[PDB]
Design a protein around this ligand. Sequence first.
Ligand SMILES: *Cc1c(COP(=O)(O)O)cnc(C)c1O
Ligand SMILES: *Cc1c(COP(=O)(O)O)cnc(C)c1O
Lengths: 486, 487
Amino acid sequence: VDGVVLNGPQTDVKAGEKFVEEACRLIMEEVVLKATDVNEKVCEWQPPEQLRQLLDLEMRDTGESQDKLLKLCQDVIHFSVKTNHPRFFNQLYAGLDYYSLAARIITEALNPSIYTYEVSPVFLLVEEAVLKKMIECVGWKEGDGIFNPGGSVSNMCAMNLARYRHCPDIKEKGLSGLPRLILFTSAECHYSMKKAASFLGIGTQNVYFVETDGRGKMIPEDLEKQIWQARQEGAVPFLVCATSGTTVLGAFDPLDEIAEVCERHGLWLHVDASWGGSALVSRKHRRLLHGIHRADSVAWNPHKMLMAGIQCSALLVKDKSDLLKKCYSAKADKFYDVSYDTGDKSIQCSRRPDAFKFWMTWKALGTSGLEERVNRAFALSRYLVDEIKKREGFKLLMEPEYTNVCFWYIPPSLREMEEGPEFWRKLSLVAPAIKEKMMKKGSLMLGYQPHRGKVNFFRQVVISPQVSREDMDFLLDEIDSLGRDM
Amino acid sequence: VDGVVLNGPQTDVKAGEKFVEEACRLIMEEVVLKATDVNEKVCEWQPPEQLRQLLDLEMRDTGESQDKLLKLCQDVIHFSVKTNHPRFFNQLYAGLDYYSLAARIITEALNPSIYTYEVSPVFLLVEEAVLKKMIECVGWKEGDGIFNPGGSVSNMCAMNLARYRHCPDIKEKGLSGLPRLILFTSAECHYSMKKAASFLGIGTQNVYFVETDGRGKMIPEDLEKQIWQARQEGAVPFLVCATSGTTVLGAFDPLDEIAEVCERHGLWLHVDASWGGSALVSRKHRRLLHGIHRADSVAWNPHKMLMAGIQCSALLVKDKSDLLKKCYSAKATDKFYDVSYDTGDKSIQCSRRPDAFKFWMTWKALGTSGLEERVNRAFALSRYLVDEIKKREGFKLLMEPEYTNVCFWYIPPSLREMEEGPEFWRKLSLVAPAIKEKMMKKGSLMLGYQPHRGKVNFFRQVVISPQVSREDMDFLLDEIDSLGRDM
Ligand SMILES: *Cc1c(COP(=O)(O)O)cnc(C)c1O
Ligand SMILES: *Cc1c(COP(=O)(O)O)cnc(C)c1O
């Protein structure tokens, strides 16, 4: 010693290291080992103003003792939704993949960023591997891609690419003097298509929506109409965005008949497979994405159907001439193959190795194990279907094309009624009220939402391979019980 | 009963439960407990084609037994860079905060998304807490914000906000019929300002750069000049982006004199404090961002100076009328709780992680006082290395640092008796890349070297981790000197 302004190490490491070991056990005791126990509440509901009185969130000038901090962690787990609980069907993700989680913890400790090979050599070789594999599942011989934070941004990137490819001078000039650029998507499209059009300075008014048929599928005959009208307005079409697996219904646009339309006019074709993309793993169901190999770009989120954990979404491009680079290049030599850097393919600088956790799963299960996981979801989906039809008071909107089982629950008081406006206006308030109860019970969680002209209906999503047939029987047994007297 | 179309389960949990327990212990033994040990290699260098031949990355139809898988994890750590090693100064982050890691692991197991209160009640109350606290450090009375994946997106989001405020019809009509929108930033700005300008359909040609003085600081007299020229071209200025802590030099634009220029013309003022933002925690050094409370929006990444872990970047807005919402809304789908506590329509993202929770865990564990002291020690260690660099010969300092960005050349002995002419620089250029090549093969150090705005290859040092000691600074210069003495 010493110096100014006072030097040493000043740290209480060996204690702070225990807090990490103690947190690890909380994960094991209170999450990992209780992950498959159906006998636990999916959520400990407490309104906002009551949960504030339970957590002590104020960050004061002084710290808190290790006991008080371990209490917070004890509570943070107790009061949060259990996304791993087998009875969690509230989102397009659920369950706990043990192998992806172990990889997830690793990434957290190393705390790597994927600027370049010199900081993340392993994880950059893994992203190369995963992207190459995914590109095979699509059917391309070569390609290119990056991992974005959420398939929402993946679509944004693909929209920005289709604009750069159409007129790469937009990167420098901007859109001031350019005519109206127009993209075409289905009205069943994710809403990130809307945020994107605005964000990229294209405007939501320039997102032409193509009519869908009775199954939620885009109609390629109409698309030709919308592309000629756009031109005849003086506007410049440049992109078509189909969806292979919508969020609500799980529909699958016909990519082979859309590709034939995009190729007649030379328009980028982007397929939003954030949800249905994982079906490409199954030889049995990968036909849902027939013709995807004719698109120019594909979005795919493994954190959904394959339980990679949040976040994990990839954008794949059919190019190999560094178009990704040519589009996202900016400022910044020796001494290694600089090709293995990717800092200038993305809009972000820092980035986490989202693709590594998936790699850990694919190694642990192989394509064969992932194939079975996707296929089983379809079985459990179609099982719930067969059981829903047996019951009265459960109306199915349609046979699902994916694992999105959309149905109403009609209480007995509303049966023998007539299919008129007055009937719907009352059926509307059923799902939201059945959701209020199952959230206070902590025994179930399903999504309710309107769609198109349809009023509040349920959407069920089978993903986790811990779900059992008995978890589907309980779904209908539970909803029935909570809405029997409504 | 058992029946069609193939039912069970048949998952073999108890194995998957070991792999998690075994990985947890692997983390403890080989990372957490070895975090501060300086005598270990900062990195196990192996080129791609040799590291590819060592990891076996191929994803086959079949899986691999847990023993090979536990080997994989063992190798991934052995060959990866140790960002927690105290002698890691290669980027604007480093070190291991044990408390943020515990929070990182917690978030990791729950695997939550922050759509709404019904999915992430806790983490939404935590994000409200952090945002409110941060907004005080800025000096605002009230505000609004969200956590983005990386300060790059924070700048992108703030730039899109200023455009919505300037003409909110751009959200629907777009930019087709509108005149040229122009923003003004410093040439010392992060490059996400260029990526953003392109991405948002504004165009890089419309990013006017204001000249910098000898300290790297924007010159408010020029800023006024560029706004009159821009307008006199028929173009429409709408945003000014100052930087409170540049990446290379660590400069701090003068926010009070820039704000006065933005207020005379009614232009959004955005401060890129992704790096220097953490200085607001220090009463001594928070003067570097004097006048930030006059800006309309602030970006601030705790995953850097405060060691929150990646990723963690916040966008703060001076509004309270749900401008963030009004701008990033797509009301795509009501009782029975206060929907105000949802944030799904404030972001450009749909799904989102609780980046702010790990920081909250640190602030709780250390208090504002602990965060203040950690920031100050970095400043001291910076000024120590500075004073030590001047004592040594062969080390030329580009300038006195305003932050913890210590930029210096290393002049091998062969070039110390030369003259300060062109040929001198041209040879000095290849010094840093070759001194970096060795320390990466030695595995004993990692700091960044880069050219800059006409300066030739020089080193950049970033003091962050409070595990760094004077002995880690003396070794920095002793090591660089040793590796380049024979050049
Ligand atoms: C889930 C989804 C997205 C994007 O989801 P993120 O979690 O934001 O990545 C986009 N489109 C569809 C059809 C989706 O299901
Ligand atoms: C570190 C830094 C950033 C970081 O952006 P990321 O996308 O989070 O990596 C942006 N701007 C400046 C000035 C920075 O120092």
